[PDB]
Amino acid sequence: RTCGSELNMEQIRRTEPLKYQRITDWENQIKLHSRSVPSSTILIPVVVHVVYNNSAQNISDAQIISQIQVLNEDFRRMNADQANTPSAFANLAGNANIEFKLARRDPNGNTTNGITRTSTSTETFSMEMDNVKFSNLGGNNAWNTRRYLNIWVCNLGDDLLGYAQFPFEFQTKPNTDGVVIHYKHFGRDGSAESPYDKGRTATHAVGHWLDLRHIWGDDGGSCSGTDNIADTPNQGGYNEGCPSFPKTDHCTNTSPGVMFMNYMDYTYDACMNLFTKGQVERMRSLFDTQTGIRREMQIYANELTNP
Ligand SMILES: [Ca+2]
Ligand SMILES: [Ca+2]
Ligand SMILES: [Zn+2]
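That is the input. Now the predicted structure with calcium ion docked in place:
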């Protein structure tokens, strides 16, 4: 799996010192800014922006609805492959109690189905430029990011599957908040290409938009990096493909080993099947009713997801 949302803290400390300070401040303050976390279902209004240069990139409404179905399964532990979670880890599995619905009202109060379509001359979008998120750069401007989760679907090229913007970046980069997914790996079955054809590229990206990090700590295989989640076993490097349970490494050398079936690893879509309770706590904390950075999204979520 390829992803543009790695946080190699050793590298960031040297290459991006202001970003290092911002991430460290966010983590020092995350416990003090998560007391009024909601006890009820969190609803996320979604807008999907299809940005296409050709017919293959202009994916079907059914393809998009299947992706929303997958998010609602994975974030509510309603994925049928939950049964595949090894019994040693199933007791750590979390139910995020987060729902996703396509928007029915656009930012001007007009009816919408929550899908936009933008033809473009851009052949390939760049994560570096964030050009898919700007109408003037060949993409499509975000819908009010305080109220909608914006998911852009486009051609990210031969390598990149998707990328997300993290919550610590919301204050300074509000208009680029959201997630971008490669069109070939959006939705389940249908036009999606194996082995990333079960909609988990977006489950993984939405996990980053909800403050989660790669489970192995983005540290080049060492045991020094962390995902800041105590119930995800310390893990060396990423896993790819479809490992066999149990898989141990130099960070967790005893069975049950590393949680390679966590959505925040780099494994194939069909071999992923859980978030942990600790990851759920972190994601839900962003909706703390008094100080949660994404709390406003809950104020008008019902209004925006009904006709
Ligand atoms: Ca961990
Ligand atoms: Ca590691
Ligand atoms: Zn990632």
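The longest strand covers residues 42-52.
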